[PDB]
Design a protein around this nucleic acid. Structure first.
Length: 938
RNA sequence: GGAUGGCAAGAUCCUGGUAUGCUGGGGAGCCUGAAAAGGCUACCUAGCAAGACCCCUUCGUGGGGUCGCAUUCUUCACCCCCAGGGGGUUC
DNA sequence: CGCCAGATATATACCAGGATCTTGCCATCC
DNA sequence: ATATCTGGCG
């Protein structure tokens, strides 16, 4: 099913863009531009302000959820404990604002005598402290919090500042005490600071630490005389904090045994493996050499490295101080099978890092470690191996003496993971020692692998977790699968990168090399990071002329970034490059910028031009027939923020009062909403009212019959705060999220119909319960109470209630509006003078401003270039072309078009592209392009 | 230009916490007001996506145990990759 | 009052340290 | 950057 042709793939990776091109070569010149499209992705950013990524927002929301749940959990565990302890927490409703604080201060100043009344105040104070327990290093334990400066310097520092400003010192004094006083003298003072952006004096500088809070907790137990048993348990309960840990899914897999995770660097299996593998690859000059080490000599040097407690033995010392070899150069090492060989004799040989650090800790703190010193002396390393892997797994989760363990945390162990698992290291070590065999051949002996084999390269169908690299990668492999099915696999692949992009180079390249070693691609080249612009501007290929575009700045300049199609043409020109040719071009580039300068010319470059002279004309041909396409991937998966995060207070409106259109849309209860829906039209399905106009009179005796109960004219119904699409969450009102998509309805004559939009949000899908599997999210009648219908166009809702309006298509943020050679005809206002300078026919949907308008930006222009322009005219005016002023005033809002004045083009086609940047016309399972004018519903 | 040792810096996330914010329930103090009922500054408490399941059931119509804003062509379909995952779909 | 066009409202900000990566620098050996 | 808001406009 594949038409085989000789072609090469070109990739120009951008920060928010990726230009892809397939160019066929007859031997040996480019003839036909098979595909050339620049996809405009988002760089993986979720919040455009403070550019945090989508995944970051998910994880922050995710951990926020578990924090609340663990906080709920641990607070209830404390309450269950202090139940049998006899105490009483603060009730929520009716207590004094300062009950907990007065407690925390009284118990530390006065000893209350009566035992029963002491219990109630004990409960109040501990409840609030558990609700406000302060910060501490989560990696530490509760007993470690006990062994801290109590109180801290920062807390004493804060207390000194307050004494100087308000001229008062409080014995002793704890933090609970100071709060209850400072709210009295200068009322309205805030305890801990915060900023949400004027004139006030605050009470504290820094956050309170759990060590300072524990200081107050231990003082009160002293003053009130509490037994150790009760006080030790309640301290361990209020400061109970889950100990952080790495998940088992985020440790890499062993490439040799994917059933086991990578071992820790501090592992003893690892230290021995490194030393045993290094010696098995050593060779000694025996002639006319060389030969591997004799079994005896190998064992002798291994043990000398294992025993040392410092990294002193070098490779020169290995050859001389141990084997007594005559010269240092008589011993070498090889890192590949029968391959080149070197060895820095001044560099140090490996040693057992973990055992040496264990040695230094026992040698320094043997008093803290007497039993383990005696123990670890004669214990063999077969047990130490399991022990140290446990040490790595306790220092991150994931016989032991408790008394000793607490002092064992002042030892610094090797952090980080290593390539292989623990059992893989152990097995490879035994075979390199027992059969005297290479590491590369130890693989073959243990695990079925040919010799040699490099660890498998990451694939195209595997992510990197880095958001900008994964956006680029996703578009890339889709384009390549489409190209490899539509055409043959390429001859070469050339890639260009515009710093951060550093990971992207290695990740994309090594993934592409797996592709090539799988499909059979000869040459795979990457470049950093400006070879493609020179390749153009040395063949008279300037994109400001390739598409007829106006100048922008007062001085004439190359408007490279202006048109988003350049990424694709850069991809096209890269198909003519090979590593040697690209650098010999970049070198010439450097030779001009320094000083002189004369020409170009080299057998590689004259060959290039003779083969590449033709592209000067193909891009002209391709731009004329408009073959270069801008595309944006579509977001269809109905996941994301369901509603804005601000909870809001309801309004209320009595049943008997007068109702206006705005008040009826705002009715919260869906069943009460349907009640008033009948009271405005008994035979109507939808609300046909316009706000700011009464539609029901002030019936003194208005009633609403409901399945639950009927409300009298004195009863009140809850209303949302504002006449805008909202829902109810957890007893509050929340605005809808931004619109997931839009449904395109139409009615009227065939030859002159009226269209309008129904703006569908993620909130709509939730309350309509349309998030279950097996739902089409774009085509499913949304109940009339959903906010989509509540704020639809009044003309739209009148025609659909009349059976006249039918769903004809759907639009989504990012798809294309091609008005054809007809162009924008209903031009008016600032748009008119816009098209005189930027004759744009392709537009992209960015938003849905109201129930009657749709937001469009031009498909070919970049926001970043014109945003610079907007900042340009406000600080240095007169330094732009008249077209510059046009474009600067245009882009902030771009186009705010009335949907009726848009979809009325017969005329227009909304395009949905393939990966190759070609429009879908077939009504396949994938989304496809259609015409709003003549589209019909099945 | 390759090999090796070491150092330093940055990126992407992940885990567990803090402090606020908003809404509800509250009331310490205060200001506009003849009021009457607010709103002004703070503080106590509960929750912080909607929800889909589980688990234990002593059947409490209820307790605790997770998932829930990423993977940009949902749902349906058919070609792949190693019994669930991961991919691609040419106009 | 209808319709633009500019203005405005969105939860936010920290903490230590694991896992996964990349650069930049120094040096010694083919 | 988007869907609202307000205010000035005719």
């Amino acid at each position: 099913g594949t038409v085989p042709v000789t072609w090469r793939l070109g990739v120009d990776v951008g920060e928010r863009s990726i230009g892809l091109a397939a160019v066929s070569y007859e031997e040996d010149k480019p003839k036909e531009i098979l595909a050339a499209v620049s996809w405009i992705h988002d760089g993986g950013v979720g919040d455009e302000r403070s550019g945090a990524s989508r995944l970051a927002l998910r994880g922050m929301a995710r951990r926020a959820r578990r924090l609340r749940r663990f906080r709920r959990a641990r607070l209830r565990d404390l309450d269950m404990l202090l139940s049998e302890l006899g105490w009483t927490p603060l009730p929520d409703k009716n207590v004094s604002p300062v009950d907990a604080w007065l407690a925390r201060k009284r118990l530390a100043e006065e000893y209350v005598v009566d035992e029963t009344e002491r219990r109630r105040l004990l409960g109040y104070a501990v409840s609030h402290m558990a609700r406000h327990r302060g910060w501490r290093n989560p990696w530490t334990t509760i007993k470690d919090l006990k062994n801290l400066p109590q109180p801290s310097d920062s807390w004493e520092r804060t207390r000194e500042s307050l004494e100087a400003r308000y001229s008062v010192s409080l014995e002793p004094g704890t933090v609970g005490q100071w709060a209850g006083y400072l709210l009295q003298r200068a009322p309205g003072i805030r305890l801990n600071p915060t900023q949400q952006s004027l004139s006030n004096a605050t009470a504290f500088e820094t956050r309170l630490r759990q060590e300072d809070v524990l200081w107050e907790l231990r003082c009160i137990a002293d003053v009130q005389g509490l037994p150790e048993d009760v006080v030790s348990n309640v301290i361990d309960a209020v400061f109970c904090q889950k100990r952080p840990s790495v998940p088992a899914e985020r440790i890499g897999r062993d490439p040799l045994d994917p059933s086991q995770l990578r071992a820790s660097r501090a592992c003893l299996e690892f230290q021995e493996y490194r030393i045993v593998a290094a010696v098995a690859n050593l060779r000694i000059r025996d002639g006319s050499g060389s030969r591997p080490l004799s079994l005896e000599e190998r064992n002798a040097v291994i043990e000398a490295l294992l025993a040392q407690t410092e990294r002193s033995l070098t490779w020169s010392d290995i050859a001389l101080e141990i084997l007594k070899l005559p010269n240092e150069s008589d011993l070498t090492s090889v890192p590949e099978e029968d391959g080149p060989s070197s060895l820095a004799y001044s560099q140090f040989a490996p040693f057992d890092e973990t055992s040496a650090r264990i040695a230094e800790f026992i040698a320094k703190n043997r008093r803290k470690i007497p039993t383990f010193a005696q123990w670890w002396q004669e214990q063999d390393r077969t047990s130490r191996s399991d022990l140290v892997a446990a040490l790595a797994d306790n220092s991150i989760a994931g016989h032991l003496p408790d008394a000793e363990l607490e002092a064992l945390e002042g030892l610094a162990l090797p952090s980080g993971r290593v390539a292989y698992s623990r059992l893989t290291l152990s097995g490879l070590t035994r075979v390199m020692r027992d059969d005297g065999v290479d590491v590369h051949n130890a693989r073959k002996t243990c695990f079925g692998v040919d010799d040699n084999w490099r660890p498998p390269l990451p694939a195209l169908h595997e992510a990197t977790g880095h958001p900008v690299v994964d956006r680029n990668l996703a578009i890339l492999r889709k384009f390549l699968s489409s190209a490899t099915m539509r055409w043959g696999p390429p001859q070469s692949i050339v890639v260009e990168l515009g710093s951060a992009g550093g990971y992207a180079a290695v990740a994309l390249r090594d993934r592409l090399l797996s592709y090539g070693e799988k499909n059979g691609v000869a040459q795979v080249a990457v470049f950093r990071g400006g070879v493609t612009a020179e390749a153009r501007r040395w063949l008279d290929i300037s994109i400001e002329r390739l598409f007829s575009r106006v100048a922008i700045f007062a001085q004439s300049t190359s408007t490279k970034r202006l048109d988003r199609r350049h990424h694709a043409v850069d991809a096209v020109v890269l198909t003519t490059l090979t590593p040697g040719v690209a650098k010999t071009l970049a070198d010439a580039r450097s030779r001009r910028v320094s000083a002189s300068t004369e020409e170009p010319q080299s057998p590689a470059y004259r060959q290039w031009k003779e083969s590449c002279s033709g592209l000067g004309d193909l891009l002209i041909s391709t731009a004329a027939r408009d073959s270069i396409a801008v595309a944006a991937p579509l977001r269809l998966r109905p996941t994301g923020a369901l509603h804005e995060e601000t909870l809001r207070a309801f309004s209320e409106h009595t049943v008997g009062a007068a109702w206006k259109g705005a008040e009826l849309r705002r009715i919260v209860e869906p069943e009460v909403y349907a009640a008033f829906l009948a009271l405005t039209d008994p035979g109507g399905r939808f609300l046909k009212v316009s706000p700011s106009e009464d539609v029901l009179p002030a019936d003194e005796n208005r009633h609403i019959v409901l399945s639950d109960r009927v409300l009298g004219p004195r009863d009140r119904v809850k209303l949302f705060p504002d006449d805008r699409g909202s829902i109810r969450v957890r007893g509050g009102a929340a605005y809808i999220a931004s619109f997931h998509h839009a449904r395109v309805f139409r009615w009227g004559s065939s030859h002159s119909p009226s269209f309008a939009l129904l703006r569908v949000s993620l909130a709509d899908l939730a309350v309509a319960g349309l998030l279950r599997d097996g739902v089409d999210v774009f085509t499913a009648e949304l109940p009339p109470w959903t906010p989509a219908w509540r704020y639809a166009s009044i003309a739209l809702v009148k025609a659909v209630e009349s059976g006249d309006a039918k769903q004809v298509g759907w639009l989504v943020p990012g798809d294309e509006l091609d008005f054809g050679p007809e162009g924008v005809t209903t031009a008016a206002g600032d748009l008119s003078m816009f098209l005189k300078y930027f004759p744009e026919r392709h537009w992209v949907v960015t938003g849905f401003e109201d129930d009657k308008r749709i937001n469009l930006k031009p498909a070919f222009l970049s926001a970043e270039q014109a945003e610079v322009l907007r900042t340009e005219r406000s600080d240095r005016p007169d330094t732009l072309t008249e077209a510059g002023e046009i474009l600067a005033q245009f882009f902030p809002r771009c186009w705010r078009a009335t949907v009726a004045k848009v979809l009325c083009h017969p005329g227009l086609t909304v395009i949905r592209r393939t990966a190759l940047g070609q429009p879908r016309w077939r009504r396949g399972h994938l989304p496809y392009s259609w015409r709003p004018w003549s589209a019909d519903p099945w």
